[PDB]
Amino acid sequence: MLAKDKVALLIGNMNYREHPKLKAPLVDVYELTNLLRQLDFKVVSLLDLTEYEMRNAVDEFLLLLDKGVYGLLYYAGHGYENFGNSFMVPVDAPNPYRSENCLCVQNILKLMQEKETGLNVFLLDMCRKRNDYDDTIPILDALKVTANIVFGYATCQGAEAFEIQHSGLANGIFMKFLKDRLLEDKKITVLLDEVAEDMGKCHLTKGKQALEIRSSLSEKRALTDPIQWAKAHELPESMCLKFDCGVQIQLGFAAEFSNVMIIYTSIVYKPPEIIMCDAYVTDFPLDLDIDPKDANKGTPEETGSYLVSKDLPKHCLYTRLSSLQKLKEHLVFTVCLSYQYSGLEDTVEDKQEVNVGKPLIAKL
């Protein structure tokens, strides 16, 4: 079977304002993103989205879909299920909340079918208990019979999906088993059936979490099928800032998610006549809500990044810019330089505005 293209939106919600926070969606999304890229998917991965941002992202996803295109949605975070409809809960959901604060997966499915996709895959890594406060009874149009729909639910209706408390960089339970099967060259239904059996050996979750598979896929389609973001993943180029005093500072940028970028700085040149100099970043747009106590750390790990010292240049200072989708205007920040001349006593301070526009998903 052939795909016209293969596109995936992955969303991982953790930083809930009014509900228990989660931890593993970060690692689950990161790792599924890379696995899907190995299978030649165009992937948008996003963390910590509000209701408005989740709908925007689905709208963007749906734009990428067309006839014959494989579309895959993965969601890791709080969810629930009422009356056969699954809902994804955004990080700004009130408590209590209801269906109007959430995205109904069946609505997304209907919209994808209208693009005449060749395959629709939903992997829902979320709880599926009822929401007693949500007594809306909205019957959607009967979906068309396109015989190309596959759901892999991390858990069964009325049950919870889990991740391991206090477990560092461990996956949630679903991704823990999915990750070791995703690359198999097998019909997606068969692949998921295998994951279900792997999970049936997980002692921790037996009797509480089991995969549910729902499928009407009547062709042997797989995530590996041959294909026969553009403005969504633009990264500013590395730049070399030369200050008046001769010091030069390298500024580099790394994508961690489509809405999380790491900036890092290092001294690449210090004139002989200057004895000491430090460079740091500051004055980021208020929208990104960067806390300066969290910036200019000696290690990526200290910024709360999934990235470790070995995936990035060494001996820099790193700053994590999450929530890039909130960036309304241009990403303008300041590179400050402190230095001192041999023979002098005064610490001199220079600064320089830098403007890299709207990176990654901020680009809209």
């Binding site: 228990p20 989660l22 931890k23 890791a76 975070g77 709080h78 969810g79 890594d125 979320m126 709880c127 991390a154 919870e160 999906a161 889990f162 991740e163 391991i164 408390q165 949630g172 921790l204």
Partner: peptide, 4 residues
């Protein structure tokens, strides 16, 4: 040990 932690539900979603």
């Amino acid at each position: 040990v932690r539900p979603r």
